[PDB]
Design a protein around this ligand. Structure first.
Ligand SMILES: CC(C)CCC[C@@H](C)[C@H]1CC[C@H]2[C@@H]3CC=C4C[C@@H](O)CC[C@]4(C)[C@H]3CC[C@]12C
Ligand SMILES: CC(C)CCC[C@@H](C)[C@H]1CC[C@H]2[C@@H]3CC=C4C[C@@H](O)CC[C@]4(C)[C@H]3CC[C@]12C
Ligand SMILES: CC(C)CCC[C@@H](C)[C@H]1CC[C@H]2[C@@H]3CC=C4C[C@@H](O)CC[C@]4(C)[C@H]3CC[C@]12C
Ligand SMILES: CC(C)CCC[C@@H](C)[C@H]1CC[C@H]2[C@@H]3CC=C4C[C@@H](O)CC[C@]4(C)[C@H]3CC[C@]12C
Ligand SMILES: Nc1ncnc2c1ncn2[C@@H]1O[C@H](CO)[C@@H](O)[C@H]1O
Lengths: 128, 238, 57, 338, 280
């Protein structure tokens, strides 16, 4: 039942923009904190951003702070990552991770690579 | 009836001696302060207490016992375990403190270090346990910021528009940029801790090098302050 | 390599699970109710056991 | 090429869930409206097992229904006599951080383990009088979360390495291994048949295994978060589990789907341990809200509330005959309710 | 027995005894039922509660019978007076022990759990009870018909040995203890940079209570005795009012102790909340 599919990504040119979507089913999406992470080719996991249940508390990674925008629609239990003015270093596989425990503000998704609450990974490449 | 009364008496004597042994063990247990040690592989967590009165390596735990001012401390370092630290960490919710070391010299990994520090500080089970932040490898930070090969702005642009606090303790002969970066990282950690801070648990940052040796006294003072604040809160004096 | 082997193991497990003979939930519920009504009598937690027979009181 | 395998797995799971919904002609919730409710369950603490120092991390009754095991984080595994609260044995553990414990059906062996990645065994019937380390079943690359005695010469173990194991005490190696789960296994339960056993992990799923075959025969994923509790139904055909989402779910080995979900809007705290009664009419589940909930297995309503515990509940067990229940929390005071 | 004003004295003493015994029995029951409250600090608190219970149940009726002005035998009245003194000294020593426990916990937080355990707690409690029984029963055997107290117990013991031996020494000890605790709280407040002045004033106000209350409770009767002994012939123009209120406050100390010490701890409030929730 617990599944997190993700769509979007692909090829993009530097300075462009792209909105990656992630549909999660099998639980109460409005009760779990969400996170967007990215792993580059050959590099380890790199957390991008996090958004709380009601979106009142949101945070972004300093390396990509301001360029990306994380949002969540609870009416259809969906997550969205709108990246603007992409860079050639942004190329990576993105994942939408769910917090292991609900009603909490602590999540250990990026700690391990074999984490379960993730999607198949959305590949993104930035180049001419 | 005696066939069972003798057994009852034997069991009573056994229970008495077992309780005596349990109290003998509880003496040393309550006398020792159990601490946790966390950090990244690149960090020098395994060399925080350069003194290292005694280093015991269990099956999968790098125990480290020592004594400061007649007080016995037992810092536990779990290194031989899977990267998933969301289940076994629960075993350390009663520890006296959690020394979290960060190799802040690795800016690309400083983000992961901050994320781990946040996840630990916001943990529901470690919500009442203070965190002793030992920013090891300060010499590496100084060298990296003086070489100018890596700009902290790429990893943390806030450093560009950040200013060193006034309550800083600048070292003699230290470059202004080194102090600025060090205290910027320290304040980043302090904010990560304050985002969900409360009187239940506090943070105790400390700047130490890989060759430092007074870390024992620093951990002693940190534990003393932690338990003192805890007792004051118990007495409603804070 | 690694991902391919993991997917192979996953599809093998899925195949092993596909051949399972899944009966309607009605039979499972009936069996559960039967077991409950048959053992509820000898269950001290459901039928208040007298303090004389209960070794705790 | 991996896209083909992913699509194949997706189609397999789609047909699986389709067959599940097809077999879901009814639901245990509506079918159980005719039976009489159990009513309020008044359970008082008959005795308190004082003596433990550190937070108790596990406990397990024995076939004799009189002696029980209780392991604490201070490195002590104590054997308590429920009838009179007499400390018979106190095994000092090499690793203070113990996360499980067990009691063989014959009572001749006791298992323990934790972050040490080793399952330490101890013989209680030693002629020397003073118990000692009987066996050290090393090999796991993760923390040992739960353990159960399959027989005097066969034992089961669940480690955080995403794999379960079945060892033989006389050998000291992995007689059988299971690598179905993807997250750290937290608990399991053996059925009276002594051939099938289910285990739950952080993958929010519970997987079944046969001691002889050695391959995952069935999997359930009705839960939402990591499963921290699991216990076999007294009949051996079903089993209940509990997740950190503050919800329990009863799965059936024949329906391959969830037919009973225990939850409440005001119950936000998760589960730590669960156990059934002698008949299964009630379902006891320990929650981290400083209390335990005894629901109606057939109606999913809070029939009893054990509110006496000054800590997070860690383990809950029922006797082989169901005369009383034992609850060990992190207060070091293992209560015995009835 | 209804004198011009001793009737109000007896009534106030009865009300004080009732309130004290009620509060302290509640404290003892809360400490006994709650298993998590079986700690050394809680041991000292329940010892103080039991001392106050003994005061309310034994010291108050004995003092009442004494004030009523009976003509019992000499040793008969001396026994009741010495028992009242034993109970008062036991309460004072329990308060001193609670203060010393708080001091060792705050100033010496690390070695607290090691130097203060269950066995050590019960040993210290027994030693303090024996000391109280020895001090109060001192004039019963080592004395250096109208049962009116000043008659059976002279102010010599009530001042030289009682006041300056087991009331003023512990008074100043508790004063210094709470002063050091206030200093420690102030040093810690300037470190927790979150109004700091508000919390500092709140902590200072709490500490001022535990010793000012102790003071206003024990200083009246002992200062009355001191002025009667060192400065006699004053005639005590308002004896039946001055000593009346002095002993009234000395006895109300019993009820004032738990409400200031027991009810003001976080663990005690949590236990009370849990108990009233269980009862609902
Ligand atoms: C003065 C008379 C009338 C009342 C006597 C009360 C005494 C006997 C009783 C009442 C409550 C009791 C205490 C209740 C709580 C505990 C905690 C336990 O872990 C050690 C014993 C201890 C400390 C008990 C000691 C004895 C005790 C103080
Ligand atoms: C004034 C006369 C009646 C004295 C009566 C008080 C006696 C009976 C009560 C009051 C307080 C009690 C003590 C309070 C607490 C403790 C500590 C505990 O670990 C052992 C028992 C012990 C030591 C209790 C023993 C009995 C006790 C001393
Ligand atoms: C000092 C003695 C001899 C007589 C003076 C009486 C007054 C000034 C003393 C006696 C009792 C004390 C009070 C006891 C009650 C409280 C409640 C506390 O939460 C705030 C302070 C406050 C209000 C104390 C303030 C100071 C007070 C110390
Ligand atoms: C009768 C003589 C000896 C003094 C009587 C004054 C006592 C009974 C009164 C006066 C002011 C009162 C205090 C007022 C407010 C508080 C804060 C709260 O946390 C309850 C306790 C405490 C601290 C009260 C304790 C009882 C108290 C101290
Ligand atoms: N002058 C006095 N007259 C009567 N009783 C006194 C006097 N001084 C002290 N006491 C009694 O002795 C106890 C200890 O001070 C007090 O509680 C009080 O009852």
């Amino acid at each position: 039942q617990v599944q997190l599919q993700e769509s979007g990504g692909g090829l993009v040119q530097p300075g462009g923009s792209l909105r990656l979507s992630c549909a999660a089913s099998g639980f109460t999406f409005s009760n779990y904190k969400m996170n967007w992470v990215r792993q580059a080719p050959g590099k380890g996991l790199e957390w991008v951003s996090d958004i709380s249940q009601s979106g009142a508390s949101i945070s972004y990674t300093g390396s990509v702070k301001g360029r990306f925008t994380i949002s969540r629609d609870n009416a259809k239990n969906t997550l969205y990552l709108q990246m603007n003015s992409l860079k050639p270093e942004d190329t990576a596989v993105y994942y939408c991770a769910r917090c292991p425990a609900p009603f909490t503000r602590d999540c250990f998704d990026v700690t391990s690579t074999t984490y379960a609450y993730r999607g198949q990974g959305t590949q993104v490449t930035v180049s001419s | 009836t005696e066939d069972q009364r003798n057994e009852e008496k034997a069991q009573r004597e056994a229970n008495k001696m077992i309780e005596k042994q349990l109290q003998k063990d509880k003496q040393v247990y309550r006398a020792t302060h159990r601490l946790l040690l966390l950090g990244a592989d690149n960090s020098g967590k395994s060399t925080i207490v350069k003194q290292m009165r005694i280093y015991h390596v269990n099956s999968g735990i790098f125990e480290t016992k020592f004594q400061v001012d007649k007080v016995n401390f037992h810092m536990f370092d779990v290194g031989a375990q899977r990267d998933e630290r969301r289940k076994w960490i629960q075993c350390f919710n009663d520890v006296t403190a959690i020394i979290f070391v960060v190799d802040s010299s690795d800016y690309n990994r400083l983000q992961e270090a901050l994320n781990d520090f946040k996840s630990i500080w916001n943990n529901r089970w470690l919500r009442t346990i203070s965190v002793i932040l030992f920013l090891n490898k300060q010499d590496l930070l100084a060298e990296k910021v003086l070489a100018g090969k890596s700009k902290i702005e790429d990893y943390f642009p806030e450093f560009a528009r950040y200013t060193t606090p006034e309550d800083a303790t600048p070292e003699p002969g230290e470059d202004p940029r080194v102090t600025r970066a060090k205290y910027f990282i320290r304040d980043e950690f302090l904010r990560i801790s304050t985002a969900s801070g409360d009187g239940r648990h506090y943070c105790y940052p400390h700047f130490t090098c890989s060759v430092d040796t007074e870390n024992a006294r620093r951990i002693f003072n940190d534990c003393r302050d932690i338990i003192q604040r805890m007792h004051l809160r118990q007495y409603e004096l804070l | 390599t690694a991902s391919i082997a993991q997917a192979r193991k996953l599809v093998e497990q899925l195949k092993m699970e596909a051949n399972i003979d899944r009966i309607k939930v009605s039979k499972a519920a009936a069996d559960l109710m039967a077991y409950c009504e048959a053992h509820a009598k000898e269950d001290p937690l459901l039928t208040p056991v007298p303090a004389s027979e209960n070794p705790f009181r | 090429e991996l896209d083909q395998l992913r699509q194949e797995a997706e189609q397999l799971k789609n047909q699986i869930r389709d067959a599940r919904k097809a077999c879901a002609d009814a639901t245990l919730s509506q079918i159980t409206n005719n039976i009489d409710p159990v009513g309020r369950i008044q359970m008082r603490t008959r005795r308190t097992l004082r003596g433990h120092l550190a937070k108790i991390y596990a406990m397990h009754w024995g076939t004799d229904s009189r002696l029980l095991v209780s392991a604490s984080q201070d490195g002590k595994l104590i054997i308590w006599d429920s009838y009179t609260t007499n400390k018979v044995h106190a095994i000092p553990l090499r690793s203070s951080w113990v996360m499980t414990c067990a009691y063989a059906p014959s009572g001749n062996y006791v298992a323990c383990g934790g972050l040490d990645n080793i399952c330490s065994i101890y013989n209680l019937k030693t002629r020397e009088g003073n118990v000692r380390v009987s066996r050290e079943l090393a090999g796991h690359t993760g923390y040992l979360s739960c353990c159960r005695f399959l027989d005097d010469n066969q034992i089961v173990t669940s480690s955080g390495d995403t794999t379960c194991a079945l060892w033989d005490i006389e050998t000291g190696q992995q007689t059988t291994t299971f690598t179905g789960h993807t997250g750290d296994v937290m608990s399991l339960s053996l059925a009276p048949d002594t051939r099938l056993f289910v285990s739950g992990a952080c993958d929010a799923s519970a997987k079944l295994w046969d001691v002889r075959e050695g391959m995952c025969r069935q999997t359930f994923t009705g839960h939402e978060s990591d499963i921290n509790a699991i216990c076999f139904f007294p009949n051996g055909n079903a089993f209940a589990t509990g997740s950190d989402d503050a919800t329990c779910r009863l799965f059936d080995l024949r329906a391959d789907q969830e037919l009973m979900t225990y939850s409440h809007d005001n119950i936000i705290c998760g589960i730590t341990s669960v156990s059934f009664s002698k008949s299964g009419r009630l379902l006891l589940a320990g929650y981290d809200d400083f209390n335990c909930n005894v629901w109606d297995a057939l109606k999913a309503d809070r029939a009893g509330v054990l509110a006496g515990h000054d800590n997070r509940v860690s383990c809950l067990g029922v006797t082989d005959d169901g005369m009383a229940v034992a609850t060990g929390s992190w207060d070091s005071f293992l209560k015995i309710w009835n | 027995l209804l004198e011009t004003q001793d009737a109000l004295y007896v009534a106030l003493e009865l009300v004080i005894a009732a309130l004290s015994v009620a509060g302290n029995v509640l404290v003892c029951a809360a400490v006994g039922t709650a298993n998590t409250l079986q700690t050394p600090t809680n041991y000292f608190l329940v010892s103080l509660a039991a001392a106050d219970v003994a005061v309310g149940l034994f010291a108050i009726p004995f003092a009442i019978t004494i004030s009523l002005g009976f003509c019992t035998d000499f040793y008969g009245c001396l026994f009741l007076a010495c028992f009242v003194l034993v109970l008062t000294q036991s309460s004072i020593f329990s308060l001193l022990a609670v203060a010393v426990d708080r001091y060792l916990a705050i100033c010496v937080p690390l070695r607290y759990k090691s130097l203060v355990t269950g066995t050590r707690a019960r040993g210290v409690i027994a030693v303090l009870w024996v000391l109280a029984f020895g001090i109060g029963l001192t004039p019963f055997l080592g004395w250096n018909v109208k049962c009116l107290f000043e008659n059976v117990v002279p102010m010599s013991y009530m001042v030289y040995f009682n006041f300056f031996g087991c009331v003023l020494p512990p008074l100043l000890i508790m004063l210094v203890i709470y002063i050091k605790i206030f200093l420690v709280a102030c040093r810690q407040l300037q470190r927790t940079e979150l109004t700091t002045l508000q919390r500092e004033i709140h902590a200072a106000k709490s500490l001022a209570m535990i010793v000012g209350i102790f003071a206003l409770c024990w200083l009246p009767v002992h200062a009355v005795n001191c002025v009667t002994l060192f400065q006699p012939a004053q005639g005590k123009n308002k004896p039946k009012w001055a000593m009346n209120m002095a002993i009234l406050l000395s006895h109300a100390n019993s009820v004032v102790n738990p409400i200031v010490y027991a009810y003001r701890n976080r663990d005690f409030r949590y236990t009370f909340h849990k108990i009233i929730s269980r009862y609902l």
